[PDB]
Amino acid sequence: IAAAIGASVNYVTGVIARDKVATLEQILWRVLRGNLFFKTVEIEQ
Amino acid sequence: LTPNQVNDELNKMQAFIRKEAEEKAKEIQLKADQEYEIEKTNIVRNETNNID
């Protein structure tokens, strides 16, 4: 909500072809850098 | 995972961000009290020399 035109917080936009690869990244993320992600997803073509 | 699980972690995120910053901010203001005294003594000793 209006914070991805700004820079008050950082968002990482990205396309990935598999929700599978999204998972592995989620694992790496949680285990070793703590619990600091908000994971949202939208379907593309 | 499920949206609920991801929201438990979300809550954790803003917890981390806040706690490391309070911890940072205590150290930051503690250097500011050492700096007040020291600068104050330095202005004074310089000046009394001039007055002398």
Add this chain to the structure above:
Amino acid sequence: EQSLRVQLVRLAKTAYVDVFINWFHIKALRVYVESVLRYGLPPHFNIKIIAVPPKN
């Protein structure tokens, strides 16, 4: 060889105990550091070391 032999067994033994205490330092600190980083609140953790009888 004789002089080296006494010195070496003694040194290994002394070294051993020290290297062991340091190893256990790292592991204890590595579980605390990990725990705060993944879990967050509450500040204090319930930590136990459980001795497993052999092969279980």
